[PDB]
Enzyme design. Structure first.
Site, PDB file in Angstrom:
ATOM      1  N   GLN A  36      39.345 -34.424  88.211  1.00 38.95           N
ATOM      2  CA  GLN A  36      38.491 -35.358  87.595  1.00 38.95           C
ATOM      3  C   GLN A  36      37.594 -34.558  86.516  1.00 38.95           C
ATOM      4  O   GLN A  36      36.873 -35.405  85.570  1.00 38.95           O
ATOM      5  CB  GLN A  36      37.367 -36.298  88.383  1.00 38.95           C
ATOM      6  N   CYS A  42      34.731 -39.963  90.588  1.00 34.90           N
ATOM      7  CA  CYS A  42      35.379 -39.873  91.825  1.00 34.90           C
ATOM      8  C   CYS A  42      35.878 -41.107  92.323  1.00 34.90           C
ATOM      9  O   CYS A  42      37.288 -41.396  92.770  1.00 34.90           O
ATOM     10  CB  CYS A  42      34.269 -39.231  92.783  1.00 34.90           C
ATOM     11  N   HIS A 174      29.595 -39.722  96.619  1.00 36.00           N
ATOM     12  CA  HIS A 174      30.894 -39.163  96.368  1.00 36.00           C
ATOM     13  C   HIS A 174      31.970 -39.897  96.933  1.00 36.00           C
ATOM     14  O   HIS A 174      31.930 -40.248  97.878  1.00 36.00           O
ATOM     15  CB  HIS A 174      30.898 -37.658  96.534  1.00 36.00           C
ATOM     16  N   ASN A 204      40.034 -33.694  97.797  1.00 29.89           N
ATOM     17  CA  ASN A 204      39.013 -34.129  96.864  1.00 29.89           C
ATOM     18  C   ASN A 204      39.746 -34.241  95.180  1.00 29.89           C
ATOM     19  O   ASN A 204      40.898 -34.385  95.312  1.00 29.89           O
ATOM     20  CB  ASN A 204      38.146 -32.845  96.545  1.00 29.89           C
TER      21      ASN A 204
END
Ligand SMILES: [Cl-]
Ligand code: NA
Ligand code: NA
Lengths: 241, 241
Positions: A36, A42, A174, A204
């Site tokens: 990102q 996110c 997140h 992630n």
């Protein structure tokens, strides 16, 4: 939306699935990790990500979709300033598919108008379910990776490997996705005994150069109820069937 | 894990074996050369090859294994972006078996998810030793082909046949395997006397249509200690028994 129980029956085989480990990565269920960059998108990468996995699994095709297109047209969110997993899927249904990552490349924090016409082959979703706070391992095993939320602490960023069990954040701040679980039996460095350390497997959105090849492992128990750092408090998985 | 000396003792055994040449190719020990193409799969092709040879030798079976499954599933490496021999062998054991290259065909740089289930007959390895930096010829004769590293210089690559000798080493930048040694006796272009030129036999991964059926000869001495370009700085041999 929908009904967990309603869909889990249509998929779940009544067989008390192995609760120790199942890893979508090694079953064609996890698309390559993205990055990102300096934009707080996110929410977008995770939701897009769960869709990519739904495709890679169900309709057996690998395709990377435009996260940038969500940041530009999902009006129920605030672009780089954050958003909510379920809102994304919502705007996804409204937009009727998203342009491939190739026709609508990601451009991080760079201003950028929303152009839905930048492509002609839009990939979409029929609907999206919400998973019960205590049915994660079960859903993960039969429905596939799940988009979830979590409280990320400052030290959480330094994580380089292993089974993270550090400090948690204030509140849910997140969005990442769950891709499976596993269980390494470590030794008790003090009692020196065969102890079983269970963990969830997170993907992630900070590029491969972070944590284990972009992934991080969170402690948990056999039941898959120990959601450290608020893990999966908000949990959704899109459906294309 | 297995530390060299425990098994090497079980095999080596002094012996005044001929140190000038032994060629696994013509002893049913070298499967056909492959081609990693424009994808950085040095490490996988090298490691896989040593396994193919171990099967071809010990278990007298000719078998080619899926390099693509390693680039997609070891995770202790970085797929087309490079990797290390020992990491491969590790993960190979973790995964407990690898798909034959026929049920899991190679697709070079073409995106591709990891599916360990892409087959039903998985071929594996019990463990893997590291061979001493000054015990190559000795190891090759009794242990079998060895996976090694080397520094390929810029002027190399045009080699079509013979005993290539030109580029020097650096820090390494490619993964190949050692398959044997030999020694051709040329004439002394200066004094005209019987001179002895020793050399090693490497197995590349650039298809049969390159050099002498894909192989190249590197200078060395009788002792099997002159490792130009670092020849075998890193040297390992997988074990199936
Ligand atoms: Cl990256
Ligand atoms: Na990346
Ligand atoms: Na692995």
């Amino acid at each position: 939306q929908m009904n967990y129980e309603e869909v889990i029956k249509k998929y779940k085989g009544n067989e008390n699935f192995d609760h120790a480990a199942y890893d979508w990565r090694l079953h064609s269920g996890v698309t390559p990790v993205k990055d990102q960059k300096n934009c707080g998108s996110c929410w977008a990468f995770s939701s897009i990500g769960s869709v990519e996995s739904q495709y890679a699994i169900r309709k057996n095709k690998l395709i990377t979709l435009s996260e940038q297109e969500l940041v530009d047209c999902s009006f129920k969110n605030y672009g780089c300033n954050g958003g909510l997993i379920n809102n994304a899927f919502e705007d996804m249904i409204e937009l009727g598919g998203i342009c491939t990552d190739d026709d609508y490349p990601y451009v991080s924090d760079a201003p950028n108008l929303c152009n839905i016409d930048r492509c002609t082959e839009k990939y979409g979703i029929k609907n999206y379910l919400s998973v019960p706070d205590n049915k994660l391992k079960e859903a993960l095993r039969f429905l596939g990776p799940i988009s979830i939320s979590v409280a990320v602490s400052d030290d959480f960023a330094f994580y380089k490997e292993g089974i993270f069990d550090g400090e948690c954040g204030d509140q849910l701040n997140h969005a990442v996705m769950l891709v499976g679980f596993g269980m390494k039996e470590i030794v008790n460095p003090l009692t020196k005994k065969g102890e079983k350390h269970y963990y969830y497997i997170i993907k992630n959105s900070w590029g491969q150069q972070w944590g284990e090849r972009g992934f991080i492992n969170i402690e948990t128990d056999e039941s898959g109820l120990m959601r450290k750092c608020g893990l999966g408090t908000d949990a959704f998985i899109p459906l294309i069937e």
